[PDB]
Amino acid sequence: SEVETVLRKAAERNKTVDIHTKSGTTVRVNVKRVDSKSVKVERNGQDLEISLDQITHVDGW
Numbered sequence: 001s002e003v004e005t006v007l008r009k010a011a012e013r014n015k016t017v018d019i020h021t022k023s024g025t026t027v028r029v030n031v032k033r034v035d036s037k038s039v040k041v042e043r044n045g046q047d048l049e050i051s052l053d054q055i056t057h058v059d060g061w
Contacts, residue, residue, distance in 0.1 A: 001036065006058045008034040018060030019050060028060055 010017045011031035018028040019041065029048065033040035038051045 001052050003055050003057055004034060004036060004039070004052050007031050007039045007052075007055070010058060010061070015061060017058050019058055020056045021050065022054045022056065 007019075008031075009015075011034055014030065016028060016030045018026050019039075020026050027041070027043060027048075027050075029041035029043045031039065032042050032047060036052070038049050039055065040047060040049050042048070
């Protein structure tokens with residue numbers, strides 16, 4: 001996946017980024033894991049998963 005690579009890129013540098021989803025929701029989180037289906041993120045110490053299919057693009061580097 002194209003955007004997957006971008007989450008991976010952020011995870012590589014342990015970056016906190018803004019993730020834009022299908023619901024128009026923008027979550028600014030730290031990338032925990034990137035698999036070819038979904039991405040695990042971290043918000044305020046909470047671990048959360050987001051599906052790659054629901055991710056549109058990353059901003060906020």
